[PDB]
Amino acid sequence: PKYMQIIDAAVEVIAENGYHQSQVSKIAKQAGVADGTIYLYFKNKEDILISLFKEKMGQFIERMEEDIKEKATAKEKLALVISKHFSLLAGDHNLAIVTQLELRQSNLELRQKINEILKGYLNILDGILTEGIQSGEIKEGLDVRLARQMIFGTIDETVTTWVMNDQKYDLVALSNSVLELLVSGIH
Amino acid sequence: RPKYMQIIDAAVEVIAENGYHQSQVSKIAKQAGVADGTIYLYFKNKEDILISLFKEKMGQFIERMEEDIKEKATAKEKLALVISKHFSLLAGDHNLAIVTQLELRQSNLELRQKINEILKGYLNILDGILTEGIQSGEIKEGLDVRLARQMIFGTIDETVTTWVMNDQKYDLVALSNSVLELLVSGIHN
Numbered sequence: 563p564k565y566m567q568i569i570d571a572a573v574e575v576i577a578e579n580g581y582h583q584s585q586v587s588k589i590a591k592q593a594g595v596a597d598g599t600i601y602l603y604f605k606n607k608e609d610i611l612i613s614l615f616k617e618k619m620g621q622f623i624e625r626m627e628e629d630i631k632e633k634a635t636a637k638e639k640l641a642l643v644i645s646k647h648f649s650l651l652a653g654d655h656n657l658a659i660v661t662q663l664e665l666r667q668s669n670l671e672l673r674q675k676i677n678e679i680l681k682g683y684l685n686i687l688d689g690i691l692t693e694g695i696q697s698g699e700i701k702e703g704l705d706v707r708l709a710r711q712m713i714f715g716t717i718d719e720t721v722t723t724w725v726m727n728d729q730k731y732d733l734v735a736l737s738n739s740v741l742e743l744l745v746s747g748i749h
Numbered sequence: 750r751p752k753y754m755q756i757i758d759a760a761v762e763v764i765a766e767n768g769y770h771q772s773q774v775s776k777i778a779k780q781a782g783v784a785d786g787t788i789y790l791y792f793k794n795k796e797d798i799l800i801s802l803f804k805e806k807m808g809q810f811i812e813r814m815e816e817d818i819k820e821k822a823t824a825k826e827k828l829a830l831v832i833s834k835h836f837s838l839l840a841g842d843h844n845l846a847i848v849t850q851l852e853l854r855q856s857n858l859e860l861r862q863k864i865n866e867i868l869k870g871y872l873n874i875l876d877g878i879l880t881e882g883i884q885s886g887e888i889k890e891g892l893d894v895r896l897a898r899q900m901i902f903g904t905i906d907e908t909v910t911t912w913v914m915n916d917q918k919y920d921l922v923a924l925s926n927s928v929l930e931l932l933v934s935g936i937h938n
């Protein structure tokens with residue numbers, strides 16, 4: 563709808579200056595819409611950011627929930643999550659910036675709302691790790707919470723370094739290397 | 750410089766308590782017990798306080814760790830000490846941890862370039878640990894240094910973040926060894 567049109571404009575505006583500096587005024591402009599229509603779909607500036615994450619990352623998470631079920635091993639499931647996460651971000655310069663730089667919010671209730679959306683992603687990781695242990699693919703005795711932190715932390719920092727380097731190298735081509743590092747470690 | 754450091758300390762406190770954007774020079778000045786003009790005698794602006802805060806703390810963090818890792822032989826041992834020192838510093842200072850994990854995470858891409866340039870000193874240590882390990886035959890052949898470093902930092906960093914998200918209520922430092930072992934051996938059986 564026009565709902566998606568403002569969401570898409572929001573991605574552009576927030577990426578340009580950062581969320582705090584971004585203005586609702588300029589979001590309407592890039593959307594090609596008037597200020598009042600923004601308040602027809604959204605409560606405020608904060609609601610736009612949450613909805614952005616819900617729509618962009620939330621839909622990614624749901625797709626992953628389905629698509630990993632096709633894959634036999636925990637390794638392969640993880641291979642797809644990383645690969646698809648890199649692809650999503652590499653297909654949109656502004657999306658990469660927003661998802662990385664605005665994931666960790668200072669304001670508590672805004673942070674809670676975004677964390678809640680990202681929990682679905684962490685849930686997937688925990689589920690891959692648990693099933694992996696039960697089948698014997700993954701280290702028995704593995705602290706699932708810690709391993710999920712490592713996996714997510716590694717994915718996130720790989721994307722963040724790329725964003726800091728103005729996305730000037732091929733993120734997607736790194737996914738298998740990232741997988742192997744997570745699977746085998748450095749020794 | 751004593752007044753310089755007192756301002757840094759006050760800034761950590763105020764920025765952690767109020768958030769960086771809701772933090773203002775005048776409130777940091779009040780917290781430090783100096784006049785507003787005294788802040789500017791040392792800093793360009795609020796932005797410069799945040800950058801210098803990071804530059805300062807990172808400097809002291811390395812100086813402890815850099816002299817300490819030299820005694821340790823293997824890459825694994827050096828990493829062990831990197832993780833525990835990283836965890837120890839942030840567990841010892843509640844407010845500093847909020848700053849590193851949240852308040853320094855500014856989305857103004859430009860400002861974030863100046864912050865990350867300070868991080869480079871630390872990431873370089875990780876790189877050196879890996880390349881020493883490569884040369885001695887300790888590290889897995891086929892490893893990419895840049896990516897492994899991103900793994901190591903991202904993993905340590907996410908562990909601190911999750912801890913901060915949970916109000917720093919559990920013993921972060923005690924997870925050091927397990928995080929090390931995950932990074933060294935991976936998730937596989």
Ligand SMILES: CCCCCCCCCCCC(=O)SCCNC(=O)CCNC(=O)[C@H](O)C(C)(C)COP(=O)(O)OP(=O)(O)OC[C@H]1O[C@@H](n2cnc3c(N)ncnc32)[C@H](O)[C@@H]1OP(=O)(O)O
Nearest residue numbers: 722723726727806807810849853854865866868869895896
């Ligand atoms: C006080 C308490 C302490 C405790 C620790 C402190 C924690 C508090 C930190 C809070 C601030 C954060 O947000 S930290 C959490 C999020 N993470 C980050 O912000 C860090 C992300 N990384 C970066 O910012 C950047 O990598 C820098 C600026 C830090 C490092 O830049 P650099 O020195 O150029 O190194 P690097 O990025 O490797 O770039 C070198 C060249 O290699 C390329 N390159 C980089 N990675 C890769 C790769 N995986 N595969 C291929 N190529 C790559 C780059 O494009 C670049 O191209 P060319 O153009 O050079 O050819």
